[PDB]
Amino acid sequence: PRLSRLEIRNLATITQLELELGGGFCAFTGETGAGKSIIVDALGLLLGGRANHDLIRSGEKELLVTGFWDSASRRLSSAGRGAARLSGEVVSVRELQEWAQGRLTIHWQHSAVSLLSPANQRGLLDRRVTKEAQAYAAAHAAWREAVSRLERLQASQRERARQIDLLAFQVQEISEVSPDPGEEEGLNTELSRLSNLHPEALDRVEARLSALSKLKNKYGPTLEDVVEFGAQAAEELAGLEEDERDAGSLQADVDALHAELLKVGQALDAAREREAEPLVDSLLAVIRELGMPHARMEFALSALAEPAAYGLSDVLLRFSANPGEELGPLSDVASGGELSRVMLAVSTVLGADTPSVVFDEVDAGIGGAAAIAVAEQLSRLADTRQVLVVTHLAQIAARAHHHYKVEKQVEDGRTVSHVRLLTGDERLEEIARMLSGNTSEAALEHARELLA
Known part of the structure; x- marks a missing residue:
C-alpha cells in the first residue's frame, strides 16, 4: 500500500523520466518549478481532475504518466482522445479518480476530494x-x-x-x-x-x-x-x-x-x-x-430541511488566519499556503488515510522556527506513511530521510530537467549550498548539526 516507481514522458521540461523511489520523507529541491511539475501536476493527473493541454510537452504530440505501487497510467493526446489506464486496459476516468483517491493525496484545491469535502469533514467529528x-x-x-x-x-x-x-x-x-x-x-x-x-x-x-x-x-x-x-x-x-x-x-x-x-x-x-x-x-x-499565530477556528452546523444522507445538520468549518479575517470557508475563501499546513497538522494529529500524500506550496510565507516545526511535523508523519514535497528550504530538505535533487541537463538540441538521488557527501554539499551560498565550512557545520 505505497508508491514505488514513476515514469513520465514528454511532460513540460521532462524528456522521459524513470524514478525508482522508496518511501519515508522525500524532499525535492533544486529547480522548484520543475519539481512542482513532477510531483503536483503529474501526480495530479493520475488522481484525475481537469487535464489542460498546457501540461503537455512544448513541441510534442502527447504525454504519458505511469505509476507503480498495480500500475495506473494517464495519457493525454493533443489529438483529443488520449486514454486512462488501471493495472491493465482502458478504464474510466471516474474509476481512476475513485481508485487513486485511495492511494494518492495531493494537497491544494485538489485536497477538496481528500480531507476537505462534506463526508470526510463530517467523519472527523462523527468518529468521536x-x-x-x-x-x-x-x-x-x-x-x-x-x-x-x-x-x-x-x-x-x-x-x-x-x-x-x-x-x-x-x-x-x-x-x-x-x-x-x-x-x-x-x-x-x-x-x-x-x-x-x-x-x-x-x-x-x-x-x-x-x-x-x-x-x-x-x-x-x-x-x-x-x-x-x-x-x-x-x-x-x-x-x-x-x-x-x-x-x-x-x-x-x-x-x-x-x-x-x-x-x-x-x-x-x-x-x-x-x-x-x-x-x-x-x-x-x-x-x-507552525507560523500563523492568532488564528481562529470553529465548527458551524446548519439546519438543513429533512433527514438527508448524513444528518439534518450540515458540518461546516470556519477559519481565519488573521485577527481581521472574520473567519470563513477553510478553502475556496482565504486560502493559499496556510491550507497545506493546516492539512499537515490535522494529518499528524489524526492520521493518514492514503499511502502517499503530498503537500504543495506549504513552505511559503513562513520561515525559521516555524519552518523547522513544519519540517519536524513532516518527519513525525513520515514515520506513519510516505510524504512528498518540493522544497527550497534547508532544514526541511535535510530532515527528509530520502533526498532527490532536481537539476537541468541539456540534451541536443533541447534543454531538459534531470533528477537524481544524493549519495551522501554530495547531499551535504548541496544542502549547505541551499543554506547560505555554495560551500563554506560554516554552512557544512550548521548543515551537519541540522541533519543530525
Whole structure:
C-alpha cells in the first residue's frame, strides 16, 4: 500500500523520466518549478481532475504518466482522445479518480476530494460520537424502509379509488331497492288480477316490476345473479378498503418514525456541539505554532430541511488566519499556503488515510522556527506513511530521510530537467549550498548539526 516507481514522458521540461523511489520523507529541491511539475501536476493527473493541454510537452504530440505501487497510467493526446489506464486496459476516468483517491493525496484545491469535502469533514467529528451516528444511520434506514413500503399505496390509490366508488355505487343502487328472488313470479299474477279487474298500489306494483327489470338488465340476468353480483361487489369493496385503511395506518406509523429520526438527529447534534470545543483547541495549539499565530477556528452546523444522507445538520468549518479575517470557508475563501499546513497538522494529529500524500506550496510565507516545526511535523508523519514535497528550504530538505535533487541537463538540441538521488557527501554539499551560498565550512557545520 505505497508508491514505488514513476515514469513520465514528454511532460513540460521532462524528456522521459524513470524514478525508482522508496518511501519515508522525500524532499525535492533544486529547480522548484520543475519539481512542482513532477510531483503536483503529474501526480495530479493520475488522481484525475481537469487535464489542460498546457501540461503537455512544448513541441510534442502527447504525454504519458505511469505509476507503480498495480500500475495506473494517464495519457493525454493533443489529438483529443488520449486514454486512462488501471493495472491493465482502458478504464474510466471516474474509476481512476475513485481508485487513486485511495492511494494518492495531493494537497491544494485538489485536497477538496481528500480531507476537505462534506463526508470526510463530517467523519472527523462523527468518529468521536459513533453511538449517536449509528443511531441516526439506523433510524434513517428504517425510515427508508417505511417510505419504500408506503409508496405502493399510490399505485393502489389511483385505480382502487375509482373502482371503489363504482363498487359502492352499484352496491347502493341494489341496496336501496333490496331485490328478492321469487318475487316477480307472483308479482305478475297480482298484476294480472289488478289490470284484469280495472289504482293506488297498481303503479307501485308496476314500478317495482320495472325496477326489477332494470336491475335485472344491469348485473343480471337472473334475479339471483343480481344479488350475487351485489355480494361480490361488497366483498371486493371490503377488501380494497382493508388495503387503503391499512396503508393509512402504516403512514401514521411512518410519521412516528419520522419524529423518532428527528429526536435522534437532535441527540447527534448535541453530541457534536459537545465534541466541538475539545477538538478545535487541539489543532490551534499546534497550528498557531507552525507560523500563523492568532488564528481562529470553529465548527458551524446548519439546519438543513429533512433527514438527508448524513444528518439534518450540515458540518461546516470556519477559519481565519488573521485577527481581521472574520473567519470563513477553510478553502475556496482565504486560502493559499496556510491550507497545506493546516492539512499537515490535522494529518499528524489524526492520521493518514492514503499511502502517499503530498503537500504543495506549504513552505511559503513562513520561515525559521516555524519552518523547522513544519519540517519536524513532516518527519513525525513520515514515520506513519510516505510524504512528498518540493522544497527550497534547508532544514526541511535535510530532515527528509530520502533526498532527490532536481537539476537541468541539456540534451541536443533541447534543454531538459534531470533528477537524481544524493549519495551522501554530495547531499551535504548541496544542502549547505541551499543554506547560505555554495560551500563554506560554516554552512557544512550548521548543515551537519541540522541533519543530525
